[model samples]
Each structure stands twice: as C-alpha cells, then as structure tokens.
Target: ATFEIVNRCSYTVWAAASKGDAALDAGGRQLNSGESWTINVEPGTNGGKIWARTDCYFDDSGSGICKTGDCGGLLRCKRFGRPPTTLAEFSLNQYGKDYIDISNIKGFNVPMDFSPTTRGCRGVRCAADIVGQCPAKLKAPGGGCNDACTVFQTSEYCCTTGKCGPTEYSRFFKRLCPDAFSYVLDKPTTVTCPGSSNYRVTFCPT
Candidate 1:
C-alpha cells in the first residue's frame, strides 16, 4: 500500500506514521510548504496510523519536543503520537478492503483530508480550523482542542462502558469536523477502499 503525504499548510509539518511494534514508513520528516513524502507499506500491514507534529524543535540526533503530536520526543517515532493530534488511521486487507478514517477522537491539531487514488472508493476529510475555534476548557496546553475523553474522562465522554453515545461535548467536535471520528463509538465516519489501492493524505488541504 502507498500513501502520498502532502503538506499544504503555510508552515512546516512533521509527518509521523506507526504500525504496531514496527514502524512501516516515514518515522518523521519535515515537510515544508507544498512538499510531500510518499510512504510505501508492506502488504497486509494492518492498524497503521498517520499524524502530523507541529512547532517542533529537533536536533541532529533527532531529540526534541513538539508542541503538538510529539511521539516520545523522537523525530523517528517508535510508537503512536500523543493526543490532541489529528489522525488518519487504516487497517489494510481487512475483510478484503482497506478501512480508513480521519479521527479526532484523540483530539485535533491539524486539518487533514484522506482520499483514495482509485476510482471506486469514497473520500473523507476534516479540513476545518479547529484550533482557532476550540473552546477554552478543552484546549490543549500548546494548541488544539482536547477530545471529550481527554478533557472530562467520564464514562459518557470516554465511552468506557455499555452502549455509549455522543454527548454535547462530542457534538462540539462533530459540528466542526463532521467527517471525522469525534468520539470513541463514532462508527459513521469510517470509509473503505479496495485493499492495496493508493491513497493520499493531505494536511491543510485547500
């Protein structure tokens, strides 16, 4: 599977990708305005996630912190990104299709769009400016809005138990990014495409 990671924002974006214990591609790369990096994942690589880190300060040894989406303070992330980060998640070769979605359940730091390169698959995106409009109570320390689960940590917000549903808190995120996974049990946001099909993930898509 192939993913073209594009940066459309005015500032730089550090893209990160992780898959289980193994990191499939692009540990982390600085993508300048209009730049892009292509990642090629092995066949049957399921449960992979892609996200962007902003306001980072890395050194030659790749040790530093990021204002948003930092993964253990490593430029070459060895694990999943921290919360208050937008995510493009995927499980390839799942039931003969690639299940993908743009998720904000962890929170939102950047606007993103995910689209299939093939003809049959439907595209899903969340390109809203969530940071600027985020409510004060749910705002992250550096930037972006925290998910309900991150902010309140209640059963209703975290969906920790039975038959969970959206609350007014989740509705707040849903209203801005209707195409993304706003909460833990948000099933409607997921989209599927043919397995092995090429896809593009753009940050700050115009």
Candidate 2:
C-alpha cells in the first residue's frame, strides 16, 4: 500500500517507518507542520509501523535524538519508535487484505488518524490530549504519555507472556481512544481494507 503521511500538528514531526528493509522513505523523513510524505509497503511486510518523532534536532549528517519517539538516536530510523509514542501499525497485503490499527500500547505522543483514502475502509483515530491529561506516574519526560507497561513493566502491565488482564491504566488509555489498542490484551480494534488501498496517516488530526 502507498501511505500518504500528513502532518497537521503545529510543530515538527520527524516521521519514521520500519523495518526499512524495503527502503521506506529512506527509513524516515523530516516533516514540518502541514507537510506530507508518501511511502509504500510492499506485499508481505508484516509488523510494519508508522509514527511521529517530535522535537528532534539532528546534525548535518542526520544524527541526534528526538524528545519523543527517538529510535537508535538516528534521524533516519532503523526501528520505528521506543515507548511513549503512538503508532499506526499494519500488516499489508496478506491473504488479499490489509489490517490496520492505531495503537497506544507503546503509549501516546501525538494525536493520529489512520485511514484508507478509498471508500469502504473505516479509518481509526486517537486524537485525544493524552499528553496533557496524563497521570503523573505515566507521564514521560517529554510531552508524551507512557503506557503502564512502559512505566512499571510489571506482569499486570507488561503481561510479559503472563496471565494478565486490564488495569486501571489500560482503562485510562482505553477511555480516551476506544479505537486503538490501549493495552496488549485490549480488544481487537483493527480495520481492514482491500489490498490495493492507499492510506493516509495523519498526525495531530485534531
């Protein structure tokens, strides 16, 4: 699928995608507010991720870290994001269909909208002010909210291949973004599109 990434935030968003084995936007691209970039995920690319890295400053050679969602300290990401970041995850062109979801399991940095451009595919969004409303314990250093799993890393939160259920934190995330996966065991909230659909991942949709 071809992804048209649009940045609607009133700030910089260094977009990143991975794994970049298929050469996704050269792994990352710096986008100013109201900017957009297009990239494609070829068939069989599962576990593909799209995200925004905020408040970043890189050297002339593209090296530095972002305040939020830094991956390997490189401007061009080999990985998509660390924790405390929202994500648009996809498994493209599998069994002739595509599955897409807006996930907060990693946490929330910016508001997002992930939708197909074509008709019939429902889009998903997590555009709440999660960072501002974040509980103290779940707040990261930057203007981002860290999920319970990222904060405490307990079996209750991390699940860690353990028998776990929802926590107050998961409920906290789920309350604001019902369409996203708030926690690992959160209900299935994925939407499907036809294999050839073109999609848009918009940052700060609100």
Candidate 3:
C-alpha cells in the first residue's frame, strides 16, 4: 500500500550507522541535505522503511529533548529486539530540530544482518596473484637447466626456469637500484663455475 511519516525538524536530517547490525543508538548519526536513510520492514508489502528525526515536543515515539546531549534510555524499545517504530531525535539535551519524511511501501527501522560464515578461497597452489613466482611448474617451450634431473652440491641451488632461489629476482633489484646495490657484489668472476654464464645460486655455508 502507501506510507506515512513525520519531518518535525526545520532542516532535513539523514540517518546512518557503522554497519547494518548496529542499532540506531549504537552507531547512529545524522545526515545533511540530499542524504537519505533506509530500513527493511518485516511482514510488509515491500519489506522496507524510511523516516526522520528531530527535537521538538515529545510524545508517543519517546524521542523528545534528546536531540542534543545525553539521550537517556530514549531508545529502550530497541534494547530488547523490537525495532523503533520511528528513528529517535537526539541533540545535546534536546538541541536542534530536524525533519525526515518517509515514503513508499516498506517497513520500519529494519536491522542489518550478516551470516556467521561466508565463502572463502581454498587452494594449495602458490599465490601468484599476490607474489611474483608462478604457482605451477612450466613445461617445454623453455630452455633452461632443469632441476628435476640435476646433482646439487652444498650451497648450490637447483635451477627451475633459470631461478634457483631468490636470485632470479636479484638482477631485477640490482639493476633497478644501482645506488643500493653498487657497493656489494659489483665485480663478476667465474670463480665458482667457469664459462657457463649460468651458475647455481650459492648460499652461505651451513
């Protein structure tokens, strides 16, 4: 059907909260012009609602003199599980007057809810989306030392796609940040494994 509401305040006020589950008093705040509030009503035609708040003469809604400071237990109706039939007006000891007009087929002050659990990703592969390394091993069409059939020595890393360990990223960091990398390992030599241009990434002796 239709709906009815009250906008007792002179200025338009908006309603908002931190989250849907937060009560009107728990995370309540006002809105400026052009802002609006929404709630879903239970057992209604559209199952939603809208309204306003302000500080004027108090009456049935129990929201008077609360538009300013300590709004007392003015929100008692929501203390249990009942939704406020109307959004309460609050101020410092009942300060300013605001208006909010509700329209359309919905309910009143519907609470926002969330399910206890939701879907999450579950996988055993490497997180390539968040890292530089590929999650899966590559096949042919590649020409580098294969780690599957190689004999490894102490301090030497078995190559996989030319990257033994963290060394594949070393050239990237070294080239991009010469100032940071200039002082260390600046000279190259074939001392470890001569003439190959490709050598195992050696680690500190354990």
Each model's lDDT: 0.87, 0.87, 0.22
For candidate 3, write residues 1-206 as lDDT tens digits: 11112222235432322112333333233433333333322211111212222332345664543332113323322321112212111111112221111110111121111111112211011101111221122111121111211213213232334433333333332243222211123332111111111111000101
Per-residue lDDT value at 78 in model 2: 81
Poorest 10 consecutive residues by lDDT, candidate 1: 19-28
Q: How much lDDT does candidate 2 score?
A: 0.87
Q: Tens digits of per-residue lDDT for model 1 on 49-167? A: 89999999999999999998898998988788888999999889877888889999899999999999887788888988788888888889888888888878888888888669987
Model 2 lDDT tens row, 66-127: 98889888878887677788999998778988899999999999999999998778999999
- The TM-score between candidate 3 and the true structure equals 0.18
- Candidate 2 clashing pairs? none
Off by over 4 Å in 1: none
Put the candidates in lDDT order, highest first. 2, 1, 3
RMSD of each: 1.3, 1.4, 29.7
**What order do candidates take by TM-score, descending?**
2, 1, 3
